[PDB]
Structures are given as C-alpha cells and as structure tokens.
Paper text:
The 12-kDa FK506-binding protein ([name]) is a ubiquitously expressed peptidyl-prolyl isomerase with considerable homology between fungal pathogens and is thus a prime candidate for future targeting efforts to generate a panfungal strategy. In addition to its role as a [name], [name] is a member of the immunophilin family and is the target of the immunosuppressive drugs FK506 and rapamycin. Three extended loops, which have been called the 40s loop (between β2 and β3), the 50s loop (between β3′ and α1), and the 80s loop (between β4 and β5), surround a deep active-site pocket that binds both FK506 and rapamycin.
Examination of the packing revealed a close contact between the 80s loop of one subunit and an adjacent molecule in the apo crystals. However, here the 80s loop is not inserted into the active site of the neighboring molecule. Strikingly, the C. albicans and A. fumigatus [name] apo structures all revealed the deep insertion of a proline located in the 80s loop into the ligand-binding pocket of a neighboring [name] subunit.
Author numbering: 0 to 114
C-alpha cells in the first residue's frame, strides 16, 4: 500500500495488489477496467458499467498523459486510484458539459492484462 506522486503531480494509491512482477512498458497493449470520477463525486465514465474492458497501447499518447505515466507503475491484477491533475488529463479545455476546464480526474483502475 504505497502512495506515490509521480510525473505531472499524478498520484497513485495502491488499493489491492497485483502480481508485483508484471508491469506494462512503453508500447505494451494493456487491458484495463476503470471508473472515472470528478472531484465532486460525479461519475463520468466507467468501463465496468459497460460490461467490457478498455484496451489501449500505453506510453504512445493514445490516452491521457496521466495514464501513460500511471498505468506502467501497476502490476497485472493490481487495482489503484490515479488522481490526475488537469494538464495530465483533459487539459485546460476539458469537454464542456462533461469535464470542466483543467479538472482533476480520479480514476479507479484495474490492470487486467499486459501484452
């Protein structure tokens, strides 16, 4: 149960452990189940509610910076909270009506798989 502050002011809180050995590296495909929330409790996205996970390549700019920085510090199976500041998330614009300008996003993510 580390808490870790990393590039971007991104905070990783470890909720439940992974294998402690299998971590994603740049380029790796990662399969994630997540839930995204605003600082005010408002939920804004959830792969769990959709019944199917999210896949992406990591550290190639295909997801928010906070995930490129954050996901690779998790081990397979690990469940963690990422607290990602605006610049590492949707930025100074956000998506108006959904995500406020420069909003801090809280993600509860579980790394399910690395390839």
């Amino acid at each position: 149960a580390m808490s870790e502050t990393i590039e971007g002011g991104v905070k990783i809180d470890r909720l439940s452990p992974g294998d402690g050995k299998t971590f994603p590296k740049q380029g790796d495909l990662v399969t994630i189940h997540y839930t995204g929330t605003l600082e005010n409790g408002q939920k804004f996205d959830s792969s769990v509610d959709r019944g199917s996970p999210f896949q992406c390549n990591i550290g190639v700019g295909q997801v928010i910076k906070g995930w490129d920085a954050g996901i690779p510090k998790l081990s397979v199976g690990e469940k963690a909270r990422l607290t990602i500041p605006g610049p590492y998330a949707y930025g100074p614009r956000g998506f108006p009506g959904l995500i406020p300008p420069n909003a801090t996003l809280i993600f509860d993510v579980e790394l399910l798989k690395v390839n």
